[PDB]
RNA sequence: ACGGCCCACCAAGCCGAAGAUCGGUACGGGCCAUGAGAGUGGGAGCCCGGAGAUGGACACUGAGACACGGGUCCAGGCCCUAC
RNA sequence: GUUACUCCAAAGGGUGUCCCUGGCCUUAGACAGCGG
RNA sequence: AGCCGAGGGAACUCGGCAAAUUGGCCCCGUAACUUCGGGAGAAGGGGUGCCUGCGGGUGUGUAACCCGCAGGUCGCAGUGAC
RNA sequence: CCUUGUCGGUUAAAUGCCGACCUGCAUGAAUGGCGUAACGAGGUCCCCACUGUCCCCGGCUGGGGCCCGGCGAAACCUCUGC
RNA sequence: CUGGGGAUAACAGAGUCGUCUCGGGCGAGAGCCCAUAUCGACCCCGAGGCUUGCUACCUCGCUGUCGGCUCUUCCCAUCCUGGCCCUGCAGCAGGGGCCAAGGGUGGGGGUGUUCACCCAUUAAAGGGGAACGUGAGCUGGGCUUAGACCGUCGUGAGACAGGUCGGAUGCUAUCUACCGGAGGUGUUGGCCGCCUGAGGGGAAGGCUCCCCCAGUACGAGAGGAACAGGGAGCCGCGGCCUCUGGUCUACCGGUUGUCCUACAGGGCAUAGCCGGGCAGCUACGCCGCAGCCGAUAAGGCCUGAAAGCAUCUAAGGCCGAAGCGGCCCCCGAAAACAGGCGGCCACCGAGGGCCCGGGAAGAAGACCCGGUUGAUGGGGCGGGGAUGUAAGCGGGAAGGGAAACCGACCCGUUCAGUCUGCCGCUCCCAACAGCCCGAGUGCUACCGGG
């Protein structure tokens, strides 16, 4: 008998088509302070740096080589407020306050909005809010937000997302909601040089695969591989049990796939397409665009590493859910080298 | 702190690749008897089914010799990887490839079995076998 | 930081980038691009090509 | 400095059974030992000459060297080191 | 355990609990303890 | 049914199955053994394009078909494909 | 037959191949015995070169497969079908 | 060869367990003395169904095969990894036993082999089941037809659970099952958007080495640990293309043979061959993958009687594992209590689809972006990039020729010429014109309010 672990995980199962294109955060970190817990951009490209090493470990001291990732990040709009209460099992929403002027666009991802509902209304409706929350009943607030993809000149139809807010008292989370809602907000107002983050968004599509490239199975013998085989597996199974088992694999749909990722570091913020390392004002765009994405000219995240996703895609970022022990400091490194030599 | 002032070992931060799987024949750069090796085995490696165990720069390897005075051959030995064809990478980013590869030939300690080596070696096999750069005349 | 030099080409590229190659007899060289290598290594000459700086050494030699 | 010493062209010549070529052993001589002598054997120590300076190759300076206590590289060994 | 049979594991052990019997000490007995 | 693949080079497999390597011409050089006929294209090594000219053979031939020489020059590669 | 017989050589490692030793279960001289140069799409072992055989798989080409229009069967079939 | 036979073998299955694998009771003794640290005769009692036999209940054209490759899963009687107990356990290591199946258990040589044997590594390189798992998955080395050789037996034709060479591998999926992708009905009027999260899945992580603690404890010496704290790597998992490599029948150049009369430009010969190569795809490249909280197992303790003492247990407490549950990741309103919230329409028409220009998405369907309240595609003009310096013109060129002229190749004009499945600006052309679905009800008990 030989042993061997098994081709794949059963983790990420089943391997189906993401549900939508813009993706759902399902867990909250615990944070003590109050801000707004995340923040969503887009997508641009990929260069590397040369910095002085903080992490604790080896090489710590010394100037490395270090891949970084690109994402605007123009400001979100605040429209509305939702009240949570505790029903027998879970959540549930009590109600929901909405501004009484937003953008004509809009309309394009909600297809219906109230005909007057003046500033008035929108007032007595904060205080109604007010009120409710002001008892003892409610359990949680959360912010309602939609991008502004028009500012960057990518799309007109926005997204529209629901984002939860830090700390441990409603009243104080109703406080803040209350002095963001109505306006825009930016990114430097919500994250911290430094961080750990969790990005989350839909993976690039590769259409209907094989087992050899969708679980890492083997190709077989060259006799098999004349005989019209070489990409098949052996078999589905035994004799008894008398049906095939879930845990065989087979073809299907691989890539475009809701992932979340752990731990990623934010090196920098930039504003209005620049960064400032030694008082100089540089560009992060390269020497002809980005392939397939322009010019950068609003705002934008330096990440370390990769992320999923294609280039102009909706990406999320959250706060560090499960950090580790060791963390290094929050704040932005030494860097000796930026690249922004041509890409394609 | 125990034995530091005598010793055979040390550390480095690059890794590079493995290059060279079991089967491989290594030219010997050292100053004894041997002159070609066949690798059998890589010290530490522990695989999975159908893999064979590779080795790169600064890796100790098991290992046959096939020319070479009577003494040494049809014998086994140790042996310490000094420079490979297949580029690897540094801290900077820049890649770092050599001429041919080449071993050196080692007691399981780490104690070589001669005085001299001709040729340039690598960084990360001084840096990680602290008792072979005194006896090479280039380490790059 | 620094941006090193290719010796076939003669330009500067930029750290992050390229190729060292080491002779066994001690003598480095730096390459930029597999390109420029792969020249070099099969045998073409670059005084004879007008994109590299070799080829203005050639044009005062003349 | 004469010279196949080397080169371009024109010829087919040169050595050899009186032993060429190839191999073995060996620094050469003046001299030494022995024997009645004819002869047989040896040729480290003193003199004349030749060659060599771990093995191999190549140069500078000087009237003169391809240099035993000067130089450069490869091979084979060793020594110091804050590597 | 909730099995008539078809179609249900033992030798060897248990101050686990509920009973029967037969001897021996007892108003200073059978442990521990003041005191050899 | 086909083309290419870094580093390693049979670790694959009953088994180098299949694929890959070599390849035309001129010159040099060529073993064991032998039924002296062979082995033998043994093995192995060097060269080959284009242009400018010079010579030889048979021939009455500035007709045709063959055999050599020197020099200049380009490419990663000159039986460059077949 | 016992048998992967014992010794030696070939490997890091030999139920193999080659060379010998005789205990020939059950060799043997025209049901021919022992050798043999040359020859073999015969069977078997090793070496050099070479390679996607393999480490570990990747990218590309053309024809199918998929969709649309048209023509248009057969094997098989108690009834059904967690 | 014909006819039959599961009335009758080989063959898997059922039954049985003599044998096989794994155990126990008692105590002769061995162990310097000391049965029980370890070993344990003779004799008695068992479990499993994984070895072989026995039987002949099932199948005589169900499949008649061994081994290997590939793929999935289960058991524990545990080889390593976690935690404990005794020892004839000083330390380092060893014996023996208890809890635990979450993870791991590999690479090679000869042989058709399973097994066994050997080699070098390794934390260790456990053993079984699933029709001796797996041929409508592969292979075909063995075995078990027809050809042939040797030995032996036989008068012979011939034979040998003896050896050897060679010797056919078919399928258009009817039902169910699984992996993924769509269209409907229902949820008691229709629709747009955001949430909840019952239930299901997870190994998403497992393991090793180095430094220090320390030449310390221990020990006569030789030798030689541990708790905490710092680093790195192997195996597995999930993603990406900045860097490096491969490919790149878009593209750029060089060159052979021939055809279009020669130049220049082209066709064919695998893209003719060779070299380079952006985007894209990829790995030989790069990024990421928690330890805590709660209840337990073996075990270690407190209190405490039955039994005035003693006793971890009979009632009660306190601790204690790579194991169980949660945090975390993936799927998830068809979750039949078939959900919550906000908003729009109905009680002509909200909304949706066909259509049009296109990808970041794609087997058909589906998904995403835009449609003149416009930079969606093309064009033009500019950036970046790949190749490598165009044609023509002029000047040289080894040499030949009275001279004119011929001449492979070189130089200059020239980072040129060609191309761009990338970026930006600009309404110059086209995103026009249309067409199709589409909600409306009543009775009873009403509820809460008139
Ligand atoms: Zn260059």
Same mark, same amino acid.
């Given at each position: 008998?030989?042993?061997?672990?098994?081709?794949?995980?059963?983790?990420?199962?089943?391997?189906?088509?993401?549900?939508?294109?813009?993706?759902?955060?399902?867990?909250?970190?615990?944070?003590?302070?109050?801000?707004?817990?995340?923040?969503?951009?887009?997508?641009?490209?990929?260069?590397?740096?040369?910095?002085?090493?903080?992490?604790?470990?080896?090489?710590?001291?010394?100037?490395?080589?270090?891949?970084?990732?690109?994402?605007?990040?123009?400001?979100?709009?605040?429209?509305?407020?939702?009240?949570?209460?505790?029903?027998?099992?879970?959540?549930?929403?009590?109600?929901?306050?909405?501004?009484?002027?937003?953008?004509?666009?809009?309309?394009?991802?909600?297809?219906?909005?109230?005909?007057?509902?003046?500033?008035?209304?929108?007032?007595?409706?904060?205080?109604?809010?007010?009120?409710?929350?002001?008892?003892?009943?409610?359990?949680?607030?959360?912010?309602?937000?939609?991008?502004?993809?028009?500012?960057?000149?990518?799309?007109?139809?926005?997204?529209?997302?629901?984002?939860?807010?830090?700390?441990?008292?409603?009243?104080?989370?109703?406080?803040?909601?209350?002095?963001?809602?109505?306006?825009?907000?930016?990114?430097?107002?919500?994250?911290?040089?430094?961080?750990?983050?969790?990005?989350?968004?839909?993976?690039?599509?590769?259409?209907?695969?094989?087992?050899?490239?969708?679980?890492?199975?083997?190709?077989?013998?060259?006799?098999?591989?004349?005989?019209?085989?070489?990409?098949?597996?052996?078999?589905?199974?035994?004799?008894?049990?008398?049906?095939?088992?879930?845990?065989?694999?087979?073809?299907?749909?691989?890539?475009?796939?809701?992932?979340?990722?752990?731990?990623?570091?934010?090196?920098?913020?930039?504003?209005?397409?620049?960064?400032?390392?030694?008082?100089?004002?540089?560009?992060?765009?390269?020497?002809?665009?980005?392939?397939?994405?322009?010019?950068?000219?609003?705002?934008?995240?330096?990440?370390?590493?990769?992320?999923?996703?294609?280039?102009?895609?909706?990406?999320?970022?959250?706060?560090?859910?499960?950090?580790?022990?060791?963390?290094?400091?929050?704040?932005?490194?030494?860097?000796?080298?930026?690249?922004?030599?041509?890409?394609? | 702190?125990?034995?530091?002032?005598?010793?055979?070992?040390?550390?480095?931060?690059?890794?590079?690749?493995?290059?060279?799987?079991?089967?491989?024949?290594?030219?010997?750069?050292?100053?004894?008897?041997?002159?070609?090796?066949?690798?059998?085995? /890589? @010290?530490?490696?522990?695989?999975?089914? &159908? !893999? #064979?165990?590779?080795?790169? +720069?600064?890796?100790?390897?098991? =290992?046959?010799?096939?020319?070479?005075?009577?003494?040494?051959?049809?014998?086994?030995?140790?042996?310490? /990887? @000094?420079?490979?064809?297949?580029?690897? &990478? !540094? #801290?900077?980013?820049?890649? +770092?490839?050599?001429?041919?590869? =080449?071993?050196?030939?080692?007691?399981?300690?780490?104690?070589?079995?001669?005085?001299?080596?001709?040729?340039?070696?690598?960084?990360?096999?001084?840096? &990680?076998?602290?008792?072979?750069?005194?006896?090479?005349?280039?380490?790059? | 930081?620094?941006?090193?030099?290719?010796?076939?080409?003669?330009?500067?590229?930029?750290?992050?980038?390229?190729?060292?190659?080491?002779?066994?007899?001690?003598?480095?060289?730096?390459?930029?691009?597999?390109?420029?290598?792969?020249?070099?290594?099969?045998?073409?000459?670059?005084?004879?090509?007008?994109?590299?700086?070799?080829?203005?050494?050639?044009?005062?030699?003349?």
């Amino acid at each position: 008998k030989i042993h061997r672990p098994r081709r794949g995980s059963l983790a990420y199962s089943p391997r189906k088509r993401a549900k939508s294109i813009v993706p759902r955060i399902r867990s909250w970190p615990k944070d003590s302070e109050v801000r707004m817990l995340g923040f969503a951009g887009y997508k641009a490209g990929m260069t590397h740096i040369l910095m002085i090493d903080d992490s604790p470990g080896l090489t710590k001291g010394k100037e490395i080589f270090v891949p970084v990732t690109i994402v605007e990040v123009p400001p979100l709009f605040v429209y509305g407020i939702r009240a949570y209460k505790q029903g027998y099992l879970g959540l549930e929403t009590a109600t929901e306050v909405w501004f009484h002027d937003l953008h004509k666009n809009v309309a394009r991802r909600i297809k219906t909005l109230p005909k007057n509902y003046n500033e008035e209304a929108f007032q007595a409706k904060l205080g109604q809010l007010e009120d409710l929350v002001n008892d003892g009943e409610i359990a949680d607030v959360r912010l309602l937000v939609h991008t502004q993809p028009w500012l960057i000149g990518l799309k007109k139809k926005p997204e529209v997302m629901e984002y939860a807010i830090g700390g441990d008292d409603v009243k104080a989370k109703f406080d803040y909601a209350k002095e963001k809602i109505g306006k825009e907000l930016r990114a430097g107002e919500v994250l911290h040089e430094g961080e750990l983050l969790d990005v989350i968004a839909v993976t690039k599509g590769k259409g209907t695969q094989g087992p050899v490239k969708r679980w890492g199975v083997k190709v077989q013998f060259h006799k098999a591989q004349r005989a019209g085989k070489g990409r098949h597996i052996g078999n589905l199974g035994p004799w008894h049990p008398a049906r095939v088992m879930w845990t065989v694999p087979q073809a299907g749909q691989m890539g475009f796939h809701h992932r979340t990722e752990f731990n990623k570091r934010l090196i920098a913020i930039g504003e209005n397409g620049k960064l400032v390392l030694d008082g100089n004002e540089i560009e992060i765009t390269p020497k002809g665009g980005f392939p397939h994405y322009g010019i950068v000219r609003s705002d934008f995240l330096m990440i370390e590493g990769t992320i999923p996703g294609s280039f102009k895609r909706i990406i999320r970022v959250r706060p560090a859910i499960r950090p580790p022990k060791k963390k290094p400091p929050v704040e932005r490194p030494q860097i000796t080298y930026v690249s922004r030599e041509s890409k394609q | 702190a125990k034995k530091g002032a005598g010793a055979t070992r040390g550390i480095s931060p690059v890794r590079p690749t493995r290059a060279l799987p079991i089967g491989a024949y290594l030219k010997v750069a050292d100053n004894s008897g041997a002159k070609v090796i066949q690798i059998i085995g /890589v @010290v530490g490696y522990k695989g999975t089914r &159908r !893999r #064979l165990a590779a080795a790169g +720069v600064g890796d100790m390897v098991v =290992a046959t010799v096939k020319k070479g005075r009577p003494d040494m051959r049809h014998q086994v030995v140790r042996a310490v /990887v @000094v420079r490979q064809r297949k580029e690897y &990478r !540094r #801290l900077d980013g820049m890649r +770092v490839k050599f001429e041919d590869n =080449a071993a050196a030939i080692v007691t399981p300690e780490g104690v070589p079995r001669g005085t001299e080596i001709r040729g340039a070696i690598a960084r990360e096999a001084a840096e &990680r076998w602290v008792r072979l750069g005194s006896i090479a005349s280039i380490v790059l | 930081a620094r941006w090193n030099v290719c010796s076939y080409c003669g330009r500067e590229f930029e750290p992050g980038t390229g190729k060292m190659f080491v002779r066994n007899d001690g003598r480095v060289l730096f390459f930029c691009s597999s390109k420029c290598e792969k020249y070099y290594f099969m045998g073409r000459n670059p005084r004879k090509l007008k994109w590299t700086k070799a080829f203005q050494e050639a044009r005062l030699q003349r």
